[PDB]
Design an enzyme around this catalytic site. Structure first.
Site, PDB file in Angstrom:
ATOM      1  N   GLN A   1       6.153   5.775   7.096  1.00  0.00           N
ATOM      2  CA  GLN A   1       5.617   4.446   7.374  1.00  0.00           C
ATOM      3  C   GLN A   1       5.220   3.761   6.073  1.00  0.00           C
ATOM      4  OE1 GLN A   1       2.493   4.362  10.393  1.00  0.00           O
ATOM      5  NE2 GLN A   1       3.620   5.800  11.702  1.00  0.00           N
TER       6      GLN A   1
ATOM      7  N   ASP B   1      12.956  -1.516  -9.885  1.00  0.00           N
ATOM      8  CA  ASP B   1      12.093  -0.337  -9.808  1.00  0.00           C
ATOM      9  C   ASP B   1      12.902   0.957  -9.773  1.00  0.00           C
ATOM     10  OD1 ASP B   1       9.596   0.959  -9.744  1.00  0.00           O
ATOM     11  OD2 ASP B   1       9.618   1.073  -7.552  1.00  0.00           O
TER      12      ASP B   1
END
Ligand code: 0JN
Length: 243
Positions: free
Chosen positions: A19, A115
Site C-alpha cells: 500500500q 528516481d
C-alpha cells in the site's frame, strides 16, 4: 481513451502486495499480472526487455494499471533478504548490467528516470532485474539544488546504485544525514571503496560521481563495461568472503 484501455471486468484480483494507492497481484483474461490501483503515459512509448512491461490501464476511477508481475519485489528487499547472503560480485555485476541495459534504452529514447535506486528495481526469476516506477543521497547535486535533471543525473544515481549492490542493500553515506551529505558532497566528498569491492568497480562509481555532468559515462558505456567486466577488467577475480 486509447488502445491501452481494457475492461476492469477482464481482471481478477487475488493477493494484495503493498500500500501507500495499493498494488495487487492477479489474473488478466483469466495471464498473471500486477495491478497498481488508485499517469504512466511514459510507459507507453517505452518497451524494453529490462523495463517492466506495461500491459494495460483502466481509465476511470478507480484506476487500474496492469503490468508484468516481477516475482521477487524490489531489488532492495531482495538484497536485504535470504539471497543477499549468497550473492557474490558476478551475480551483482550481472544485475547492475541489466539495469544499465534498461537505462541505456532510456538514454536512447531521450528520457529521464528521475528516481533511480534499488527500491525501484524489480526482480523476477533467474536474477532478472528490471527498471520501474518512473532521495537526496541518490540524487545528483545539479538536480537536488538547481533542478538540472538529465540522464547524467541518472548516471550519478546508478553509481550510488552500485554501492547498494556491493553492500547488499545498505543505505549510502552510512551514519550521515541528508544535510550532512549535501554539504559534504559539495565539498568534494565521495563514498570510499566498499569492503571486498575491487577498486576498478569503485573507479567506475567515481566516474558516475564527477562534478561536471558531461564528463560522466553513458549507460551504453556502463552496460558494456559491466558485461565485459570479468574478462576485460577483472579476469583475475577470486570470490572473497562476501563478494
Ligand atoms: C513491490 C511492489 C510495490 C509490490 N510492486 N510494484 C510493481 C510495479 C507495477 C505494479 C503493477 C503494474 C505495473 C505496471 C507497469 C509498471 C510497473 C507496475 C510490481 C510488479 N510489476 N510486480 C511485482 N511487484 C510490484
Amino acid at each position: 481513451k486509447d488502445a491501452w484501455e481494457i475492461p476492469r471486468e477482464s481482471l481478477r484480483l487475488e493477493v494484495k502486495l503493498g500500500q501507500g494507492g495499493e498494488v495487487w497481484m492477479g489474473t488478466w483474461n483469466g495471464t498473471r499480472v500486477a495491478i497498481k490501483t488508485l499517469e504512466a503515459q511514459v510507459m507507453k512509448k517505452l518497451r524494453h526487455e529490462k523495463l517492466v512491461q506495461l500491459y494495460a490501464v483502466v481509465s476511470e476511477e478507480p484506476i487500474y494499471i496492469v503490468g508484468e508481475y516481477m516475482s521477487k519485489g524490489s531489488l532492495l528487499d531482495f538484497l536485504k533478504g535470504e539471497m543477499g547472503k549468497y550473492l557474490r560480485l558476478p551475480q551483482l555485476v550481472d544485475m547492475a548490467a541489466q539495469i544499465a541495459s534498461g537505462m541505456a534504452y532510456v538514454e536512447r529514447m531521450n528520457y529521464v528516470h528521475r528516481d533511480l535506486r534499488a527500491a525501484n528495481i524489480l526482480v523476477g526469476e533467474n536474477l532478472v532485474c528490471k527498471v520501474a516506477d518512473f532521495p537526496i543521497k541518490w540524487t545528483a547535486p545539479e538536480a537536488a539544488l538547481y533542478g538540472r535533471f538529465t540522464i547524467k543525473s541518472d548516471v550519478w544515481s546508478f553509481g550510488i546504485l552500485l554501492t547498494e549492490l556491493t553492500t547488499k542493500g545498505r543505505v549510502p553515506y552510512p551514519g550521515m544525514v541528508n544535510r550532512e551529505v549535501l554539504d559534504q558532497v559539495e565539498r568534494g566528498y565521495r563514498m570510499p571503496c566498499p569492503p571486498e569491492c575491487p577498486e576498478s568497480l569503485h573507479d567506475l562509481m567515481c566516474q558516475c560521481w564527477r562534478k561536471d555532468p558531461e564528463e560522466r559515462p553513458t549507460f551504453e558505456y556502463l552496460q558494456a563495461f559491466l558485461e565485459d567486466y570479468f574478462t576485460s577488467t577483472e579476469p583475475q577475480y577470486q570470490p572473497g568472503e562476501n563478494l
